[PDB]
Symmetry: C2
Subunit: 263 residues, 2 copies
């Protein structure tokens, strides 16, 4: 409570680096305790995002992201249940050049985090977290739900890619901490998008005419997203990310000749 609220402040000091691991780990433990009040933990993070300083605001967003990824699922479930989340579409810290230039990333990052919560609200699970493979949800989900879902992944993916950062803009520890988490979400979200597309291709011949039609449009839009993804992983390569962590895209884009199976 006070211990929770004090820890949120320590994670979000004015210092120019990401939130410290020691504060994060305590926050993560907080989300795992049946007695902690999640809403109050959340409200403290929202309050920090009314600060005028870019450093404070960006650290509060990063903290929220890290709790969505590593915290108990009850945290994201609450965030997904509110009606309003971050409203930082007009944020601008004019106190210095660093401020002006970081303000833009703040806007774009906060939009991604909003879209991450809305996606959870819409499908009741986290795309980044569920079983992968052949025994997984995204591989074994009926044709109707699939057609419904893949479009939600696509949307979360676009918001993620709109961060649109270049290597030469990654110049302090705050934005770099955000980028490292964005990287982790991007690779998992891609895996789930790919699996979904694999299921589709599998069932696209045995399906109704108008379905086939919607299908077509998803594979269609997946291929343009593949290219944007490649541009993103190339930023990652430029920055120095271990090439073993960067996934290989040499997978599933040759068959656009079902644009005729609608005979």
């Amino acid at each position: 409570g006070s211990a929770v609220s004090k820890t949120v402040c320590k994670a979000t000091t004015h210092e120019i680096m990401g939130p410290k691991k020691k504060h994060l780990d305590y926050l993560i433990q907080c989300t795992n305790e049946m007695n902690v009040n999640i809403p109050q933990l959340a409200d403290s993070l929202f309050e920090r995002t009314t600060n005028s300083s870019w450093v404070v605001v960006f650290k509060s967003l990063i903290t929220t992201h890290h709790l969505m990824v590593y915290g108990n699922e009850r945290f994201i479930q609450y965030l997904a249940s509110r009606n309003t989340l971050f409203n930082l579409s007009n944020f601008l810290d004019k106190s210095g050049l660093q401020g002006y230039d970081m303000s833009t990333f703040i806007r774009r990052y906060s939009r991604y985090l909003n879209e991450k919560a809305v996606s959870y609200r819409q499908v009741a699970f986290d795309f980044t977290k569920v079983k992968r493979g052949a025994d997984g949800v995204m591989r074994t989900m009926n044709t109707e739900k699939l057609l419904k879902t893949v479009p939600i992944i696509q949307n979360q993916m676009d918001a993620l890619l709109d961060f649109n950062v270049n290597s030469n803009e990654l110049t302090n520890g705050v934005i770099n901490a955000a980028f490292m988490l964005l990287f982790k979400d991007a690779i998992r979200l891609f895996a789930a998008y790919n699996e979904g597309i694999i299921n589709l291709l599998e069932k696209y011949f045995d399906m109704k005419k108008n379905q086939c039609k919607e299908g077509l449009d998803i594979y269609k839009k997946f291929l343009t997203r593949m290219t944007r993804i490649s541009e993103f992983l190339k930023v990652a390569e430029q920055v120095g990310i271990d090439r073993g962590d960067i996934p290989d895209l040499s997978q599933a884009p040759s068959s656009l000749l079902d644009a005729l199976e609608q005979h």
Copy 2:
């Protein structure tokens, strides 16, 4: 051969970023093919380190590191069988300031890579790669070999920590790629050092007097290394590394009161 040698050149161009993932992956496949001549692959990498340019030389070192970590074990086994490895103790690229400042990291990195090979030669396995836990080598190894080994881990660890970089020196994609690999080795090497110490503590009461003595000296030196390690992970924290990848050190340094069991 020519395909191998051409790929080494592409990994080590003059461009200021780490070696590209596409060239690395082909090199890794090379190490997995029973027909590829390992020595010739190696010699090409050594030849690149006679270039006068810091970029070329640092990329050749990074490529070698990445093959030691992700390549077939036959690669490191060969490197460990030569008598001379890198000799870059006097390297200096004076062509520009970036050169002067990178030269020092080149020296220190090459020493680490030498020590990684020598360690493999000495114990016949890679500390970063073996089974961890309670069913592992480092947890289940007899008292005699243990006393022999832990000192080799310690030595590899010191060479690794002598890289001695600050966050404000991580300023281009080449040195950042080196650092990301160093990070991966550091966390695994620590795990193995910790496991070793756990075995020791376990057997330190049931052992000879002079052994106990040597033991003492290893726990002794492990505690000072713990501190240096903490300083290293703090650089990692400053740079923006996902705090979930950074391990928690809150483990095994309270018992220095066996410095009296030698009664």
